[PDB]
Amino acid sequence: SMSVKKPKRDDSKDLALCSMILTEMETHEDAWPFLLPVNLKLVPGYKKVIKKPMDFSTIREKLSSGQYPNLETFALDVRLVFDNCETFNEDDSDIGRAGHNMRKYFEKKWTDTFK
Which amino acid type is present at position 3? S
Which amino acid type is present at position 108? K
Experimental method: X-ray
For residue 67, the domain's CATH number is 1.20.920.10
Domain that holds residue 87: 1-115
Count of CB atoms within 10 A of residue 82's CB? 20
What does the DSSP 8-state code read for residue 8? Answer: -
**Domain count of the fold of the chain:** 1
Nearest Cα neighbor of 83 from 106, 53, 46 is 53
DSSP string, 30-49: T-TTTSS---TTTSTTHHHH
Resolution as reported, in Å: 1.8
**Residues in CB range of 50: below 8 A, 6 or more apart:** 38, 84, 87, 88
